[PDB]
Write a protein that binds this ligand. Structure first.
Ligand SMILES: Nc1ncnc2c1ncn2[C@@H]1O[C@H](COP(=O)(O)OP(=O)(O)O)[C@@H](O)[C@H]1O
Ligand SMILES: Nc1ncnc2c1ncn2[C@@H]1O[C@H](COP(=O)(O)OP(=O)(O)O)[C@@H](O)[C@H]1O
Ligand SMILES: [Mg+2]
Ligand SMILES: [Mg+2]
Lengths: 658, 559
């Protein structure tokens, strides 16, 4: 191989290369323009170390505080049914709608797998909306809360067009913490200094900045509350109520055990009341902390009172539900309420004590927020240009490896030189004619008919000094061109004023009579099988100028018929009335009719297909002929097409001149 | 390959190399003279560390204070319509106009993409101006403030020529901060010293120095504020603690705290305030031009190697004589519908054809008759050129010559000789003419000819008629030489039909077009059909340096 060969192979296979590369780059471009953009926000913090602060910022304590603060455990996703709906919706200029939720409590199916219950909300207008969990349709209103079927829901400020759908999930707290921690990173930027660089990435430009602000302010508030808590009575406070709450918990547990020694609505309202009580307790703690560290008119405090009123209304509705159930149910419900509330409050006080104790050991002074979080308006992912370049290069390398595989798996004939190395005289090279009719009659000025005229001129010199005037055209494989070449060559030899007979000795799948216009009665078979005469089998081609003998009816014993002496008598009689006899035969690697006929044929020629046959195949065919007593004069390449690799290897070898 | 070959290839392709290199260096020169110059200013800050100071300089706090102080969120760009108007305007010596704005408030469209509202201001004179956002035309005056159509604007000291336009944007504060931060850098210069090198690059030599001065002063003031914060807090505590010796002690402590708070020299010092280097740091013209020249050279070289390695044509008669093909001549290009051998008999091509005639006069003895057939491998090789001119040059030596144009498909000999188009070769072959009415006379020649006549529908079947051999046998008794022009052999088969009656046959091979394998195929196809080719004739030769360093001159002029 060399530069010419490889350039030729690339030029020949250019369609495949261009198509594959175009597909790959189209897929890359679609992915780069349909992927969800990812923005990044960052903040700068001053610390008076930083190795323990990096680890303390990313602990479940701080992140859990943020999750509880911002209600990040309610996941809302706009509904685009296909996996590409979001990208095209963004591209078409549709602003993505959003809804605000401050209270969500699903019935907590909590089955084996689906640990994250979800519902679907459909927007009807600016005010009303519809909810479906498992086909159960409900109607709700912005403002007033919904408490139905053990489902608590509160939506404010629906900003979307009617008909939109949203999937609403309450994913578990640890899942929310893990999701936030996965995309949030802390660095020092100096490896020794007091500067902390906080980073958070996500697909919502405003929400990520809000989350990072919450994280930074929670850290700062922790340290300032630490420095304040030196004289604060909160530590001794918790130290006092902790044994009391523990004793009350033990008393409740003992009472439950004594009463013990399962209604669906009962346990549903029970766990709903438990969750409400937890929210009231943690909200009381949050209200105390905010009132100590912030003002009443601050929006956070107002939101805290609003949530308190909402939760108290939910608790009142739950109590009203409790009052309507049988006493035997509400007795156990009160027992379980006391037990669960005691346990939950005990755990909350242990967590509070741990938070204070971990604070008091902090050795860092006052924290100084230098840069509050802002979102970079240019997305950091996806990186469009590198994606498109990777697509282009991947397409190119895949196309190249397929091209080399096709080149290295190629075994067919490429040029008459391959046959002529072995010693096989190639007498012609008939190209593809892109134009049931004879080519040499319909389109006499075709390129293939010019090649066949060249073949006629070669034969007029090869067929002299032959024992008689019979020419047999055979081949190695079926559908190689024996009949094409034989019929057209008879046509082009008949127009030079010579009498030509064309015998179709393919008694198996011959169609010469179809292609010439036929009288199917009394073909070659009926002559061989004794039921016809030598004069009733010969016909006339309409647009030809030569006679023909069709195969007749297909016999069941073709190879045994051609051995009968009637065949040689027919050939001997015809050779005295005609100038040329052309016999078409089946292949030789398929059947043996060609080698039976070839005994009476003065000249024999094989036809070799361009890409299909192989040099070994033609060698085997010539040796199988010469083994049976038939001397093959030469070969005729057929179906040639122009290829660049052949030019940079051999040359053009064909032209048009008109 | 060797030194001679590569030098020859470079000499032959000199036009391509010069053109490509000139184009790339012209593009590089245009870019280096039309790129907007970028000046650089720098300052030196002393720290009494330097790792957190670097990150505190480049924070949104200091840079945001600078943006707010200097109104850097109002972006003004003078309007030149093309991407090269500014560069040529600078080259033509026109100073760039500028205007001062202290308040701008656009209606803040804030659509999906265009987050930066923009207007265009057209200057009419030293005082008045016009404003247009989206076709809404308004008029304003320097001095008096404008509040119209949700647009607040104040422009002062318009310094420009009338007709100029300025694109005015209020890009958002964060965008201004990011823009300033991209062009602002800090370095330590010692990895331990309190020396910091502040650098700022921009396209306005004065404004960048002003901005860097503002940044340095903001940083210094902020640092001294932090240094005095502790003393101010202690003084405030003492003031809140004041309710007799203890009273005097507290008064003395308060006075000392006042001194410390007022002095407050921090551990930061401005050694060098910013000044702008008058030589732009970009574009670097010399490296740009050198890159352009080198890129042009390497592109030209790789293109030359591709053309050399993809070349397949014949280069010299040595290639044909390797295979065993006797080359009888090499006819060069004649740069001069007329016969060359008559219009300009002193041409170089006619001299080469006279050499061919002399070779033939010795090659054509001991031949079975006096018929010469000139054929070829591909169309447009020079078969008719050589046949007609050779007949002309053989006719002037007092010999009778007949030129038969047996190219019944695309022959134009009658056009080139001056014609009576009736009764050509076809009309003779198809029986509708006699042997005597087909022969005509060349005017400036001296030899007879037989034209192709009318194009028949069966050319190759006509030449198989015995009438053709009868014509040749009759003409061989009345003429000293018969030259038959034929179509190619790789295209049609007329040449191999005619060549049965021709005593001598010669192929014509074009210089750069045909290939050695192509000529081998043509000669094998002739010899397969019973026609033995005597030799070849190279045609269309040109002088090339690579041929000199490989083969030689092989031709000269002598007049
Ligand atoms: N050079 C060619 N150009 C166009 N079609 C061809 C050519 N050679 C053969 N064919 C066509 O391809 C088919 C197979 O050829 P055919 O001679 O009939 O098969 P077989 O040799 O087995 O008898 C035929 O339809 C034929 O017309
Ligand atoms: N050495 C040459 N110098 C100048 N012109 C030439 C030369 N050889 C051929 N030509 C011109 O180029 C054209 C092609 O040559 P021509 O012999 O007429 O075609 P063809 O060989 O196919 O019969 C002609 O117009 C010819 O005059
Ligand atoms: Mg067949
Ligand atoms: Mg010609």
């Amino acid at each position: 191989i060399d530069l010419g060969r490889v350039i030729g192979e690339l030029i020949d296979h250019r369609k495949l290369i261009i198509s594959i590369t175009s597909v790959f780059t189209l897929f890359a471009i679609l992915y780069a323009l349909l992927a969800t953009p990812i923005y990044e926000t960052d903040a700068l913090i001053q610390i008076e170390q930083s190795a323990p602060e990096t680890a303390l910022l990313q602990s479940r304590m701080i992140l859990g505080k943020t999750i509880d603060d911002l209600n990040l455990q309610i996941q809302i996703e706009q509904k685009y049914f296909p996996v590409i709906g979001r990208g095209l919706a963004r591209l078409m200029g549709e602003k993505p709608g959003n809804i605000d939720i401050t209270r969500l409590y699903l019935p907590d199916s909590d089955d084996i797998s689906n640990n994250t219950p979800s519902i679907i909300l459909t927007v009807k207008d600016k005010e009303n909306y519809s909810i479906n969990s498992d086909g159960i349709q409900l109607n709700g209103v912005v403002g007033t809360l919904l408490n139905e079927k053990g489902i608590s829901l509160l939506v404010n400020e629906i900003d979307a067009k009617p008909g939109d759908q949203f999937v609403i999930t309450q994913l578990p707290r640890l899942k929310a913490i893990s999701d936030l921690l996965k995309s949030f990173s802390v660095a020092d930027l100096g490896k020794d200094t007091g500067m902390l660089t906080l980073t958070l990435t996500g697909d919502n430009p405003k929400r990520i900045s809000h989350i990072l602000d919450s994280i930074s302010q929670n850290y700062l508030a922790q340290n300032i509350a630490r420095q304040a808590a030196q004289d604060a009575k909160s530590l001794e406070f918790l130290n006092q109520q902790l044994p009391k709450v523990r004793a009350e918990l033990d008393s409740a547990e003992d009472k439950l055990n004594a009463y013990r020694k399962l209604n669906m609505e009962a346990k549903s309202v029970l766990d709903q009341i438990v969750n409400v009580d937890n929210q009231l307790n943690e909200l009381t703690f949050r209200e105390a902390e905010v009132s100590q560290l912030y003002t009443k008119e601050h929006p956070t405090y107002k939101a805290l009172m609003e949530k308190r009123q909402t939760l108290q209304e939910e608790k009142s509705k739950l109590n009203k539900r409790v009052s309507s159930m049988p006493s035997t149910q509400q007795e156990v419900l009160r027992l379980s309420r006391d037990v669960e509330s005691g346990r939950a409050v005990y755990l909350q006080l242990l967590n509070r004590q741990q938070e204070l104790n971990i604070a008091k050991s902090s050795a860092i002074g006052n924290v100084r927020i230098i840069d509050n979080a802002v979102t970079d308006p240019n997305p950091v992912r996806p990186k469009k240009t590198i994606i498109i370049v990777i697509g282009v290069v991947l397409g190119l390398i895949v196309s190249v490896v397929l091209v080399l595989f096709q080149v290295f798996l190629r075994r067919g004939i490429e040029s008459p030189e391959q046959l002529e190395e072995i010693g096989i005289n190639v007498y012609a090279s008939i190209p593809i004619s892109e134009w049931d009719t004879l080519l040499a009659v319909g389109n006499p000025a075709d390129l293939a008919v010019e090649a066949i005229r060249g073949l006629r001129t070669s034969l007029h010199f090869a067929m002299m000094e032959a024992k008689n005037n019979v020419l047999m055209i055979s081949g190695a494989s079926p559908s190689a061109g024996m009949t094409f070449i034989s019929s057209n060559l008879a046509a082009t030899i008949a127009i030079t004023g010579k009498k030509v007979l064309f015998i179709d000795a393919d008694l198996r799948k011959g169609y010469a009579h179809k292609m010439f216009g036929h009288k199917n009665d009394k073909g070659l078979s009926e002559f061989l099988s004794g039921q016809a005469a030598a004069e009733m089998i010969i016909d006339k081609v309409e647009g030809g100028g030569f006679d023909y003998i069709g195969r007749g009816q297909i016999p069941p014993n073709p190879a045994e018929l051609l051995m009968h002496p009637r065949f040689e008598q027919l050939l001997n009689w015809a050779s005295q009335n005609y100038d040329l006899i052309i016999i078409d035969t089946p292949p030789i690697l398929a059947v043996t009719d060609a080698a039976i006929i070839g005994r009476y044929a003065g000249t024999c020629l094989l036809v070799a297909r361009f890409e299909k046959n192989t040099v070994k195949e033609i060698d085997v065919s010539m040796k199988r002929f010469e083994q049976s007593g038939v001397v093959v004069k030469g070969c005729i390449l057929n179906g040639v097409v122009k290829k660049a690799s052949s030019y940079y290897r051999y040359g053009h070898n064909h032209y048009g001149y008109s």
